[PDB]
Design a protein around this ligand. Structure first.
Ligand SMILES: COc1cc(C(=O)N2CCC(N3CCN(C)CC3)CC2)ccc1Nc1ncc2c(n1)N(C1CCCC1)c1ccccc1C(=O)N2C
Length: 125
């Protein structure tokens, strides 16, 4: 099988706006995670063909990655911050579903998730 198309990063039917919280998700949260030593597996959609994972998109039907999130934020795709937080949580949960506890990539996702939650908590009033 082919790869699926990547998640949409624009949608002409979906109202969109910029908010202070979404600006913070791009300029602080995404930027901090993107620069982390463990970011690289998450910077683009899973290429199941190149990785020889014919079952990845049989198991993972809601894919997400930080390249898609970065584009969504840059494109002002979202209406609210909780939508974008959900995209990060989908990305982490996918890793935990396909892999097993204690696997290398799971420890990498767990470290990024800890940092993600710290940066969200630091959002100033
Ligand atoms: C461009 O994408 C990749 C490149 C590579 C790769 O071989 N390289 C070459 C070495 C590069 N490093 C050079 C040294 N640098 C210090 C770090 C980068 C990193 C990219 C491996 C996996 C890649 N993709 C990938 N994406 C997502 C993965 C995953 N792999 N992995 C790998 C599992 C351990 C690390 C990533 C997965 C493999 C099987 C099942 C699931 C996963 C998974 O859950 N995720 C999140």
């Amino acid at each position: 099988s082919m790869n699926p198309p990547p998640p949409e990063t624009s949608n002409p039917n979906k109202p969109k706006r910029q908010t202070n919280q979404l600006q913070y998700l791009l300029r602080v949260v995404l930027k901090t995670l993107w620069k982390h030593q463990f970011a690289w597996p998450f910077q683009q959609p899973v290429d199941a063909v190149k990785l020889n994972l014919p079952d990845y998109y049989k198991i993972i039907k809601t894919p997400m990655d930080m390249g898609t999130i970065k584009k969504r934020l840059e494109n002002n795709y979202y209406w609210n911050a909780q939508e974008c937080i959900q995209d990060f949580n989908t990305m982490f949960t996918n890793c935990y579903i396909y892999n097993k506890p204690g696997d290398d990539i799971v420890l990498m996702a767990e470290a990024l998730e800890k940092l993600f939650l710290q940066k969200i908590n630091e959002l100033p009033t």
